[PDB]
Ligand binder design. Structure first.
Ligand SMILES: Nc1ccn([C@H]2CC[C@@H](COP(=O)(O)OP(=O)(O)OP(=O)(O)O)O2)c(=O)n1
Ligand SMILES: [Ca+2]
Ligand SMILES: [Ca+2]
Ligand SMILES: [Ca+2]
Length: 275
């Protein structure tokens, strides 16, 4: 039955299978060989799919499980309480997520949730759990955990695909004065940049804007930094460590060395063509 699904065929290549039983409102994984409680970090507590299938009958478990490790690339996307009694997606965020992420999708054991399995890499800035007022929730896991495997294929999505998971950052929660006069003057003179499009060298747009910022802000490297973070060119790379500094501070220091003219509340017909 399930072992013919292409996603189950892919997971069957690994000896990372367990079985699970519903102890109250949690799901405890078990070693399918000896029947003792299994650990998600000890590989010898697992077995292949055939030992999990056999151990499922012997000890009478609720279903199969697959342990996610730091060495296999499977991403477990858990959508809690997104289906109605007819197994139709009732949450609007889940309908949009399933449109943006098309991979193996199965109905979770309780019958009202969904599991999405993707071969990729999670964004490092999203939380592992995001609760919604709907009562639904979005959970993402890459390792140190096991996921229940039902095989109840949803919408014919029976194959694990390799996808980029940046779109998850728009569905899940994330984690960790006189500038306005300068900003208005820059927009006035056409010195304020647009948001970067697709195919553009974002790093090249940073230096051009930083060069302009070095002129209008008077090489006040702290003011140039405050204004850049309020610009459409801001991103995580700005604060990323690079050779003892940050990519942002190295860029702002380069801009100060590159420009000669300086706006000094007097006249502003000195440097740099408008965007
Ligand atoms: N140490 C463990 C063991 C259990 N879980 C895993 C097991 C399944 C997974 C998903 O959580 P649930 O939604 O509660 O289980 P489910 O398989 O998705 O079942 P359902 O969503 O239908 O209730 O979490 C975990 O977080 N880490
Ligand atoms: Ca779930
Ligand atoms: Ca859950
Ligand atoms: Ca992994």
């Amino acid at each position: 039955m399930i072992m013919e699904i292409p996603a189950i065929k892919a997971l069957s290549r690994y000896a990372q299978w367990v079985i699970w039983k519903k102890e109250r409102d949690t799901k405890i994984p078990y070693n399918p060989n000896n029947g003792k409680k299994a650990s998600s970090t000890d590989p010898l507590a697992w077995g292949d799919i055939d030992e999990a299938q056999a151990g499922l009958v012997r000890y009478g478990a609720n279903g199969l499980g697959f342990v996610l490790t730091k060495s296999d690339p499977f991403v477990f996307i858990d959508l809690d309480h997104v289906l109605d009694e007819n197994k139709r997606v009732k949450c609007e965020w889940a309908r949009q997520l399933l449109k943006e992420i098309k991979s193996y999708t199965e109905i979770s054991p309780s019958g009202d949730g969904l599991h999405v399995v993707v071969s990729g890499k999670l964004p490092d800035y999203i939380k592992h759990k995001t609760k919604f007022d709907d009562g639904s929730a979005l959970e993402v896991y890459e390792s140190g955990r096991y996921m229940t495997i039902t095989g109840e294929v949803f919408d014919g999505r029976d194959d694990i695909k390799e996808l980029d998971l940046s779109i998850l950052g728009e569905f899940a929660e994330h984690k960790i004065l006189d500038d306005e006069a300068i900003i208005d003057l820059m927009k006035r003179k056409g010195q304020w940049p647009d948001a970067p499009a697709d195919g553009d060298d974002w790093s090249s747009l940073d230096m051009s804007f930083a060069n302009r910022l070095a002129f209008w802000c008077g090489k006040d490297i702290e003011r140039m930094d405050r204004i850049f973070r309020q610009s459409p060119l801001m991103r995580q790379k700005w604060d990323r460590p690079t050779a003892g500094s940050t990519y942002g501070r190295i860029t702002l220091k380069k801009a100060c060395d590159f420009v000669d003219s300086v706006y000094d509340p007097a006249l502003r017909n000195e440097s740099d063509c408008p965007f």
